Design an enzyme around this catalytic site. Structure first.
Site: not given
Lengths: 141, 141, 141, 141, 141, 141, 141, 141, 141, 141, 141, 141
Positions: E8-9, E16, E21, E73, E76, E86, E97, E99, E106
């Site tokens: 999301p986002n 944003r 970012y 990624n 949130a 899972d 993973e 980011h 943050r």
């Protein structure tokens, strides 16, 4: 023009409880909003979903569709959807968080709002009238 | 009639682990649940999704479809979906929460169930047989 | 055969609450378990005690007396007797944990079970029927 | 007739901060409440004190003075004055809690209100306009 | 071949912030991943969704589709989707993973990842180059 | 008739401390209780055990034996015996919890009573005179 | 001579609840203490305030005015007034803490008393008799 | 030029584990880091110490020695050495924090990096290749 | 003469694990302790019980039977029986706490000892040799 | 000119302990600060109150009265009074917090200061000399 | 042979305290430890250091030096040096942790040992004799 | 004479920040202390180290070198060095804790000092003058 976005389970307003949520249905609620906005020179579109991802997209895309504010009841999502928080922070419109009930007179977990830090403000506990209060703030600003 | 609803990742039973979950597939699970209901005079329908939203909607609309009870394994949602809790509270059917594994013998976070407060009861650790036992309770009631 | 062991206070079932517990007494729960057991190819013996030490001794000794499994309601000891936890782990029989009430819908302290991790599974919320369910699991296994 | 009560430090409105509080002074805030109140049918009286006991006193005594509802901004006392909570509970008028700033975008200790559980509802984050939304809910009800 | 998946986002990158970012958009991001992949002997497919359920689906399915690894990624959802955890544990492919930002400089809640434990590793804080480093690890493995 | 019950270690009053307990023995405690019952017209039986199970049976069986109220000092059980809490909730007699010392001027673990929520009241810090104030409350009620 | 001091809100005894506090008023309570003290050979003076600093000045001053002891019901300040604690620790008279209700069968915050570590003892639960028990201790002492 | 810095226990790589840490030694590690630097236009020096103070000095001093960037693996000091943190903040070079293992898949205390908030970024879990990844980021910047 | 007292579940030494507890039986443990005593000039008697009450009585009485010291392994009671703690504190003999396994290398709850603060010390982790080390301490003192 | 404010119970200096506060009076303490002030060309005024709300007014109003700076010993209020925090932040003078005792060498609750974040600095543990240290700082500044 | 290693502040044994530590000095402790070892056929070296780094290297390098076991008193580093913990895990020798004082009877932070989980066991409370106890274990093993 | 001791990073005073620590160097701070002391009849020597070990040795040895009080700035060691704390407890000289910045207005981990409890007192928030304040207290004492 203002977008009013409702989260999960708000579609069952009317059946769900007596003295916790009240008698008014989701339909009766939009028709209340339509009028509160109308008297007051605010056009309104009203939407509800049970899907986090659909709520997020509505908030992401409100500015593109020409709305200039959002009134947002996330339903139980308000206590854990950080993805919705990032959606409101990632878009430019003012957002007012609204809740029918007083979150501070129910279960402990309802007392914590992950979306409220990015909102203009929060109104809660006034039943349907929470929405109306948000529309009166939006009209002035 | 009874609705058996399953949350995320349970579509992959068979290949996720062998000492954690077992060998039985989601297909074999439904077939077992059909035969258990049937020996016992209970019509079953069995559904699974990876979407919180879809789970919610199925619990919400279940009584309108004519079901008398829901058996519910939210998968990992059990530990954070307050939206699913509210869904179960917002509808009139008895809900029995089921899990294949014993939630109390794995990671700490599995030990907390946010849906369980609103269910008739909870059964877990018996593998496929947790579903069985939910059906015996429900036939008697 | 199976051994059904009950902890403190369960001797007072019937007179203790109407809605929390029910009216069914300890005498009637045992008669209900004998008949559930019987139809169904499981012998049961049924014991209750108010002493942690007595409960421990009965779990430690069940295998030597011939039993193949234990159904166990620790009563309030479920939330603090690590001595009981170690008793069940010190012996070879499968142990099924059972509660009349839904532990997740009462005081916060009731939500945590210390015996649960060493049990095959847990069943709770279904009144006397929690016991029935543990028996149907055990008969199949 | 509605009593608007304000706690510690709100007498210094206009001089504490730019970004946090804004320019309107305690005096300008009572006249804004005076007008928002008259325009729409409500007599108002507006008090502020730095003393917890004084606040407790004004809320206890309000219905004996013939007021019909309390609008209450406890200042920082909202985060720790359980004697004010008890005061609002011990008396029969509806109380609306109101804050100028959004509590959830400031320091962590601001986030929890011990008075909120005994209030009809809470509105927060709208500057002086939070007091107005309180008055429109109250007018209708 | 590698699946690069975003939650999301991330579709709003560009608009944003700037110094949270940056200005590179999701679109530019994919072409960067294609190019970095290409020098280096790796095919990429890049995907983005605002629904937990669809991220879960794609991680469950990546291996059937013939991918050899996932770069993920979750946006949130990394702070709360035990369902995604899972999903990653339920399928065979290594997951890296990634980011854009340093999660540790943050807000407090951004520092805890519920997915990281099931991933091969985590790269974060190098902006778009976090994706590049994941691909450099995957090309060597 | 009232039953005065004492839990573990209180048999050793006399030699445990000077400053914490003082010099009155259990024997002298019961004789004081016998005198305080008489003057004021209340029959008293006084008991002590080191066994949790025995204290519980005593509280369970008091109504049946004909007592009208229980004065209860659980000793250290007070900070952990949930089974004693349920014993007290499972029986109709009013229970008054008593302590020789002020539990709030000692170790932190001593401050929390798990039995007290189910008691009519508690009295502590007054040495032997705690038992007497309990008797004077109960003679009146 | 003994002083009985009562903290905030205890002036509305009589109209706050029925089942939580009962019907007796602050005036009826002082009457009762007058008589209970007289039948005991103790003179008493009775006071109440809503102000922390006023309660503080009374405990500080008591020994100067000739009082031998203080019976103190702080009201909600018992759960946070460390200045009251320090007041009681800065003076030589013994202080008995008293509450009408059993703090441990109400809200969680009610269960922690910051005054109690400095008091000779505490009596709580017994309604206006809590005060009678305090006077009987003190007459003996 | 870039300075690679390594804290306690890393001198023992090779003997310390096989699947936790893998088999490559400290020596083998600097050799891989020199090769990775030197095709790619970065000179590197590589240092290790078991002393917090020595690591602190090395970070303080690196800009004086001409280094343009720091790659930093503090070993266990990552979970507690705020002095290291303040060293990284007292100096202007950028720092990439690197760990051979995935800190989120191990003991609870390993998940909190006290140095991370001050670093450009972090890479962990990729064995020796964690260093490579920090180098390619740094070659680019 | 020294008294060695053993709490719940230690009677099942032999069959409980291989690599958690290992192979010596309670019987064999008391022989080893018999011999370790004598090479060293110390009479020993060895008791085990499953009842908290009975451990409590044994510790309370040890001195009256003529013992000069107590080696105590309370079993899982070490983590919760504040009644045992009080018993050790209410009697004059030195007590050494002993455990076969290393309490710091097992579940988080085993790491807290409520009895240790009143013992002369603790020995933990050395299997049957924990008891030997206690006796060596006591023969010196 | 500087204003030195003291909160609750600092008027009882001289009678509270010999080892906690020592023997110097509030009287002797203001004499003392008038001399430390005079020696070094600092004018001083010295006030003390038991009422949170008075301290707050004095800190709010000090610039109006033409003071340049405050020295503030809040007494027990330093640990819970966010209202005093906000008073300090609402006015433009520097405030030095001061205490006589070392807070970190007493009860846990004394270690936290809710005022000190908005003060220039804090000095504590030097008895009367703490005030003096704050004066020599304000002199230079 | 065995290596006995001691961390900070233990060089001052003998003038730190009387009822906490003792009067035996560090040199006397060594002489004792040498004798306890020798009489039993077990050679010893004994070292002490105030530097974490130095303690770490001594643990790392002990096997290389031909020692066969380590007896370790890390001093206050036991409550926070994970680097020491990792040092003990990085090397093949068995490690017994030893403390002069009973850790469970001092300040709370002393009750948590970060090195204990990696040690064969722990002995504490017995003064010098805790070292003796560790040597007798090691000699038999 | 007085020994002034500084921990890690304090050597880099000047280039670390503007608004947190200001512009003055450690060199210039020691000049400043030299003058403050000499002016005031006090010999001073001033030391700084980045090593926990060395700070501990300086505090341990100070009473032997004939100094008679220590001024002590631990740098970030103040929040975790329990080894420093014990060094200060093991030596007879009064020690004053000093910081340049106000710890209560920075990150949360800086609010807690593990050394402060063993110190005569603390002064912080006054830059270089924090040291000066320390010196004046010691001059008097």
């Amino acid at each position: 023009m203002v977008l009013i976005l409702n989260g999960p389970n708000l579609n069952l307003l009317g059946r769900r409880e007596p003295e916790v949520y009240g008698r008014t249905t989701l339909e009766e609620l939009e028709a209340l909003c339509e009028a509160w906005g109308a008297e007051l020179g605010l056009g309104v579109v009203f939407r509800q979903t049970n899907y986090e991802g659909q709520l997020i997209e509505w908030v992401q895309q409100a500015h593109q569709e020409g709305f200039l504010a959002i009134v947002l009841n996330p339903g139980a999502l308000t206590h854990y959807s950080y993805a919705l928080l990032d959606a409101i922070r990632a878009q430019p419109l003012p957002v007012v968080e609204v809740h029918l009930t007083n979150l501070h007179a129910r279960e402990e977990f309802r007392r914590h709002s992950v979306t409220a830090p990015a909102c203009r403000g929060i109104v809660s506990g006034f039943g349907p009238l929470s929405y109306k209060l948000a529309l009166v703030y939006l009209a002035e600003t």
